[PDB]
């Protein structure tokens, strides 16, 4: 309640209150357009399930202000 009541005090801070979404691309919509949704990023680890997933966004790991999309997307 303190975090939300702080954000209501300033309209300028609301444009700062975008919490790390970065306007990231998460694949493609139907019609094949860019998705571009605000996404909070959470790092995880598993030592039994090794995550060979169908949908993985970046083929290159990590975040270093350099992006590269994966060709496994249908669009």
Give contact residues for other proteins (rule: CB under 8 A).
1, 4, 7, 14, 17-19, 21, 24, 26-30, 35, 37-47, 50-64, 66, 70-74
CB-facing half-sphere around the CA of 48: CA atoms within 13 A: 0
And the tokens for 57? 């966004």
In the bound state with other proteins, the residue whose beta carbon lies nearer, of 12 and 30, is: 30
Nearer to other proteins, 12 or 47 (CB): 47
| Closest alpha carbon to 75 in 34, 47, 38, 24 | 34
* Last residue before each gap in the chain (C to N over 2.5 A): none
Least distance CB 12 / other proteins (angstroms): 13
Residue 32 Cβ, how far from other proteins at the closest point, in Å? 11
């Amino acid at each position: 309640i303190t975090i939300l009541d702080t954000e209501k005090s300033f309209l300028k801070c609301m444009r700062k209150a975008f919490r790390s979404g970065k306007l990231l691309q998460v694949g493609y919509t139907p019609d094949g357009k860019d998705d571009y949704r605000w996404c909070f990023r959470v790092d995880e680890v598993n030592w039994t399930t090794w995550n060979t997933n169908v949908g993985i966004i970046n083929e290159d790991p990590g975040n270093c202000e350099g992006v590269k999309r994966t060709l496994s997307f249908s669009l």
